[PDB]
Design a protein around this ligand. Sequence first.
Ligand code: CA
Ligand code: CA
Lengths: 305, 305
Amino acid sequence: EEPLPSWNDSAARRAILEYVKSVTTEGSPRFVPVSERIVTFDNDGTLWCEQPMYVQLAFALDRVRLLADKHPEWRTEEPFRAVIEKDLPALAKLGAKGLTELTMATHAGMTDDEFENIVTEWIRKARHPKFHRPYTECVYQPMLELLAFLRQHEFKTFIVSGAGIEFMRPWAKEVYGIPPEQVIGSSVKLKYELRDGKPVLVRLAELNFIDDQAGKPVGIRQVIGRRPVMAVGNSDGDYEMLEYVTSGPANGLGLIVHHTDAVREFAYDRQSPFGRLDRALTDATSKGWIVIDMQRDWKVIFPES
Amino acid sequence: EEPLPSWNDSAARRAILEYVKSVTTEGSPRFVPVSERIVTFDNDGTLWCEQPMYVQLAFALDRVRLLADKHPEWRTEEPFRAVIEKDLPALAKLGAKGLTELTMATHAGMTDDEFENIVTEWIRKARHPKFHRPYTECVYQPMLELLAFLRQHEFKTFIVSGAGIEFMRPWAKEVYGIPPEQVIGSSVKLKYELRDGKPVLVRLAELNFIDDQAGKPVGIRQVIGRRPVMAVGNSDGDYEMLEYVTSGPANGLGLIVHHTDAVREFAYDRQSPFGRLDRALTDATSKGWIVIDMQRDWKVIFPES
Ligand SMILES: [Ca+2]
Ligand SMILES: [Ca+2]
């Protein structure tokens, strides 16, 4: 049909269409005013691919390798040692905090614009080792359809990710239709100064915020100032975001992207170092969280090139 | 004329109309794509009245008075002593940091929703000691017109204030047409938990962010992810915000609300404990900042009741 053409008939497609209709039709008992139609998405594993590692970790790896010729101490200092020796099991222990700390330690003292240029150049030159396309083409076509569908019904679509806010902001508008003011992520602190008479923001070697696990409802409440009426995630790091939206007196809709398709994408859940999905999957039924089976529910995974 | 009906012919009205036309007309050399049309306003002294004190300070005063029966130590502990003894000169030393610390110390341990209810009840019951109307009716009608005019031309209007984000969010949408996700302010840290099975955010006795002076470009860059193309302020605390927008290679528009009208509002600048305007006023000409003379440039100050 017209809406969600890459989605087969499934629990998830039925729930999405029913819910959006119910909250946007004047006179419906569940009608939500346009201004309150906030929906939050994780990025890694929800909107795009996160195997064999988080894309920002791939970026951090290349950056460390490029910088390593000035750092004899990195042959022994963690996590740089793991990065240099290509030790993927060690790197899986970083999490959101470790990933932003690694990025923080390697890009302090430069401006926001300098960092953006670095990210932009990397994300157009690097490619996925499996798909041999830019990482920004390893986005999920069915989720692009979902984003458009929601925006057509006057939802504001936000990203709420553990990844670095400034890693996603350079390309999220072009790729997802999501502007920088609707991207929430982990961050370092900034300092204002003038350089050559030019006002700039400079990155500090200090953490500002880690937007994962119980951090997600905090990031949402601080930045958006509203409880979202819908949320989509894929891992146990999304548990609190989904709960905040769906549980107690709130009656919002939560969905989980379940990676079940080893042929067209990757199959993983409870054992995965990246995007581990276990506790949230077990509790889905009791919470009313609707699970998207990628293998069965999506007609295509990625957009045509 | 149709646009800005409460604005007389003035440098400010000419600059606003010219600039908005220039950046929103297809084919103009200064055309700014719709997605980039970000404008930032201070609140206190820019959108509404801040004499005889910041409205949030009035709120904090009432809250301290209500709570004082449980705090024998407040007879000696500052700033509570000053609040109790009605010592306005001492209270003028607080600034944005002190104001948020005072609010932080008196509302820790309650939920975001509990705090919102407290603010909402106060702001509808309290009244300005001069105008004898709710503080939310002591907003500037010409600025309401400016906000509408900008939104009609597809600008996104943000507040960027030193005051508490959660003090403004309960009423800013109704009063200014600005939703919570477009309010930037000072804040305390939050913690996620469940209370009676209900997911909530709880206020901590810990500062998160102070959004004043050189903090304003930081708050803007972190939350919005964009340099605004226009900004309006009124005090020296807005200097960095205006500079960030107008100076160096950026060529945005900055305006300053100058309180020159003692008859219809308040007259103050260089000597005022609240909304002190001195360094920014002296530098306005050199920066290209356009000064709004309230006495001469505005046909009315407040909306009709
Ligand atoms: Ca994820
Ligand atoms: Ca001000």
